[PDB]
């Protein structure tokens, strides 16, 4: 139910992971070390987050795993964009790791990703994305992956959940009071951005899978596992 669902998501928010710039100037290697080290630690906390979304832990293990494998980069990116929303030209990876757009030039292929992330963040800024809208959209990201049958009532449970989250977002938007037509337009504008997040996510994944090829960074643990696919 919408008020309670929204409160749960609010209370589910993962902690901000702290990381600092290296002492020495960035290199391609050390920049990727920082961002993947951050990502690995955020993944640990993403799991606890997911488990706090009502219904999530009632899905079958495979469904839980499959949604998280599918959406984790999108969710890292969406949390990054929310952190950065008020700081044009910057990506607020952590309180002490604030990258200017130009710093992506440090690593081959990453400027384009920064630019995609920055443009999507500016669109959310232009729409004046509210905290409670971001909570619902981020949860919609987790829950809205293609599934196709796997060969292993979870899937009906998934549909009900996503439904409730989408209802909660519609309910949040109705608080603004704007015209019925404008509430439809805002919903569309928000959801159409899900594509942009998926698209950036795809470019991010491929970057990381390739870096990992080149051994331009060693990757560890949860992050390595998620990537191994």
């Amino acid at each position: 139910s919408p008020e309670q669902l929204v409160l749960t998501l609010l209370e589910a928010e993962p902690p901000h992971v702290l990381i600092s710039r290296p002492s020495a100037p960035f290199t391609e290697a050390s920049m990727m070390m920082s961002l993947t080290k951050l990502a690995d630690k955020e993944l640990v906390h993403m799991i606890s987050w997911a488990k706090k979304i009502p219904g999530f832990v009632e899905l079958s293990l495979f469904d839980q795993v499959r949604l998280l494998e599918s959406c984790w980069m999108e969710v890292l990116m969406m949390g990054l964009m929310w952190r950065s929303i008020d700081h044009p030209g910057k990506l607020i990876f952590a309180p002490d790791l604030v990258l200017d757009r130009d710093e992506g030039k440090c690593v081959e292929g990453i400027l384009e990703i920064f630019d995609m992330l920055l443009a999507t963040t500016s669109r959310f800024r232009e729409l004046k994305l509210q905290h409670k809208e971001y909570l619902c959209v981020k949860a919609m990201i987790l829950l809205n992956s293609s599934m196709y049958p796997l060969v292993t009532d979870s899937s009906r449970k998934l549909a009900h959940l996503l439904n409730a989250v989408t209802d909660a977002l519609v309910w949040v938007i109705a608080k603004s009071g704007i015209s019925s037509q404008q509430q439809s337009m805002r919903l569309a504008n928000l959801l159409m951005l899900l594509s942009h997040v998926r698209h950036a996510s795809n470019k991010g994944m491929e970057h990381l899978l390739n870096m990992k090829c080149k051994n331009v960074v060693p990757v560890y643990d949860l992050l390595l596992e998620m990537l191994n696919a």
Binding site: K51, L61, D221, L222
Partner: peptide
């Protein structure tokens, strides 16, 4: 395969 993920979900 999801050796560590299974671990944190369960």
């Amino acid at each position: 395969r999801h050796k560590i993920l299974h671990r944190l979900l369960q």
